[PDB]
Design a protein around this ligand. Structure first.
Ligand code: HB7
Ligand code: K
Ligand code: K
Ligand code: ZN
Length: 357
């Protein structure tokens, strides 16, 4: 029962060459990694080597046009990199972005393979750039390829096509890319908790609302938990896990759990506006570990307070290693709008899940 860890400093090379103060800094992952060494979590883990995703593996979720357009950025001069990135919503590109995107996806492939072959029980992936905003045919919100979506498809390719994968997305933003990719799919259950503000928060789309339950055979397999008008924290996310995430997950019975683990909902994040504590993330991780015989892969998405994301993700790795979960409140009453949100999701998904009756 070992925990895997994958990290490669080459993923720092991707950067915003016109703004050295951009929040998607290279030091996001180096600070997370350095904290794992200071807390002596690194030497307790088994080091998974990073690798490059192949274009065939990328084609599991993305179109040939999108892959070839991102690949062509390798050769561009800065003036043309700037024009190309301006065609997207919140995207900056450099000459090494494609390679870094390949390394983030290939690293999680090796981690899922290590989990599904039994080499490790679970794993953590300290990777960048993130992926959950990336669509089949376009890049968006600092994401080029959908690392979590690709990993679920890669997981099915090395086991069986119908492998039931649960994607839990606790990044403060809606994973619009992951939802659309698996929207008609009933083998991948997508559960996202995200700040919504009636569609005013990025990515500013009503697709993130609670009534989007999936399409076709995927009806019931898309669970949006949208927060509105409130500084959500540990009590709200714990109650969402107790009423929605866990009863639906246990009925779905996943064989593999992927966590789009953004930490921009953590306390102190400069743009998330929430106050989830590192002990809160630790509790959420310990919960998910009770699923799928403990086969949990935690993939870094967003998070932009260097101290916050380093302490938060370190708490998650400590849970995967088997350390005792923190004791939290449980009796703290929720903000009223959070009870409204949880009740709205229960109402929209009760027809599809007998555990929600
Ligand atoms: C350079 N600096 C300091 C910022 C730049 C953009 C924002 C921002 O606001 N966005 C969201 C957004 O709404 N942009 C439109 C807009 C228009 C006018 C005013 C304000 C915003 C970008 C963003 C995208 C994805 C993720 C993510 O993947 N997180 O995990 C994070 C952030 C903040 C600071
Ligand atoms: K989310
Ligand atoms: K789905
Ligand atoms: Zn985010």
């Amino acid at each position: 029962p070992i925990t895997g860890l994958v990290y490669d400093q080459r993923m720092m090379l991707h950067h915003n060459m016109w703004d050295s103060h951009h929040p998607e800094l290279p030091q996001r992952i180096s600070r997370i990694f350095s904290r794992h060494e200071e807390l002596r979590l690194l030497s307790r883990c088994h080091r998974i080597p990073a690798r490059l995703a192949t274009e065939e593996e990328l084609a599991l979720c993305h179109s040939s046009k999108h892959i070839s357009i991102i690949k062509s950025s390798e050769h561009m001069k800065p003036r043309d990199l700037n024009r190309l990135g301006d065609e997207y919503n919140s995207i900056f590109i450099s000459n090494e972005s494609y390679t870094c995107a390949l390394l983030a996806a290939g690293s999680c492939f090796n981690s899922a393979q290590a989990i599904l072959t039994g080499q490790v029980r679970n794993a953590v992936a300290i990777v960048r750039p993130p992926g959950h905003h990336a669509e089949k045919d376009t890049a968006c919100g600092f994401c080029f390829f959908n690392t979590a979506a690709l990993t679920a498809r890669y997981a099915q390719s090395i086991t069986r096509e119908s492998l039931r994968v649960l994607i839990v997305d606790w990044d403060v933003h809606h994973g619009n890319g992951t939802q659309h990719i698996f929207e008609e799919d009933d083998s991948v259950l997508y559960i996202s908790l995200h700040r919504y503000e009636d569609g005013a928060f990025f990515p500013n789309s009503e697709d993130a609302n609670y009534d989007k339950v999936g399409l076709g055979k995927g009806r019931g397999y898309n669970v949006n938990i949208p927060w509105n008008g409130g500084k959500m924290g540990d009590p709200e996310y714990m109650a969402a896990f107790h009423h929605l995430v866990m009863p639906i997950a246990r009925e779905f019975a996943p064989e593999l759990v992927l966590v789009s683990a953004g930490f921009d909902a953590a306390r102190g994040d400069p743009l998330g506006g929430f106050q989830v504590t590192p002990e809160g993330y630790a509790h959420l991780t310990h919960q998910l570990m009770s699923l799928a015989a403990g086969r949990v892969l935690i993939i870094l998405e967003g998070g932009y307070n260097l101290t916050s994301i380093s302490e938060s993700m370190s708490m998650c790795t400590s849970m995967l290693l088997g350390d005792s979960p923190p004791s939290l409140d449980h009796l703290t009453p929720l903000k009223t709008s959070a009870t409204v949100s949880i009740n709205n999701v229960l109402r929209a998904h009760a027809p599809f899940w007998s555990s929600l009756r």
